[PDB]
Amino acid sequence: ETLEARINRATNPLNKELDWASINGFCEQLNEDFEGPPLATRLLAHKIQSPQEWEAIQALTVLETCMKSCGKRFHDEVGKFRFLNELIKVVSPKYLGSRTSEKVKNKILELLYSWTVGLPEEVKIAEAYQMLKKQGIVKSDP
């Protein structure tokens, strides 16, 4: 089983409900390899920008879960603009924002904020979130 195989089952549009076996399986495996973290964030960013809501949503639950489970190895990867920019394009009107469901956009804003609190060391996350706040995309802390 590869990260791609895992992520594809954890964010599969056909799922009648969340597949925790696959979601947690993906967080466990992305740490079993020193290459995983940077690769997992690229796979998630692509799923999170899916036009298929149920796909991007499950992907956000996967991202959420791995943040709580994994340590700095993964935290640093999500904490880079290389990944935060992908989350910004999904919620920022200047990009996919207009063409993205309020469900997904609000979910991204909830996670972004929950990291500024649980992981204040990740200066990038706070900078990115602060920008969304001054541009209007974020009226208040969820």
């Binding site: 880079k80 603009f81 935060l84 910004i88 920022s92 200047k94 990038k124 900078e127």
Partner: peptide, 7 residues
Amino acid sequence: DDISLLK
């Protein structure tokens, strides 16, 4: 490395 913050 890492890229700059999106505008």
